[PDB]
UniProtKB/Swiss-Prot annotation:
Basic and acidic residues compositional bias, start-end: 80-91
Polar residues biased stretches: 26-36
Region: Nuclease, residue numbers: 1-97
GO process terms (BP): defense response to bacterium; killing of cells of another organism
Keywords: Antibiotic, Antimicrobial, Bacteriocin, Endonuclease, Hydrolase, Nuclease, Plasmid
Entry keyword annotation includes RNA-binding: no
EC number: 3.1.-.-
One GO MF term attached to the UniProt entry: RNA nuclease activity
Residue ranges of the region described as Disordered: 75-97
Family named by the database record: Belongs to the colicin/pyosin nuclease family.
Function: Colicins are polypeptide toxins produced by and active against E.coli and closely related bacteria. This colicin is an endonuclease.
Protein name per UniProt: Colicin-E5
Amino acid sequence: IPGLKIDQKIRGQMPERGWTEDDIKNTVSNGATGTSFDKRSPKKTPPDYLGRNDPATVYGSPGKYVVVNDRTGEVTQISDKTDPGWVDDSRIQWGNK
């Protein structure tokens, strides 16, 4: 644990967004920093088309995070580390409470 799967859309975004595989691995293994969800209608989950409505965990920091589906281990989002003005997904609940 955790997972990890990275779909081809995310792999394509990685060098555009400042991520290497190692950065991903390291960010994730440093531990949970927040919580989100992987909520995707069936049409949006090729090739299986089953849909996701799963809890997700956030790893890394604001502007520099990856979001991981807790059931599947799929990475669902990566921020653009390379954009000092990246707008964090407002839906993430950071830290605890």
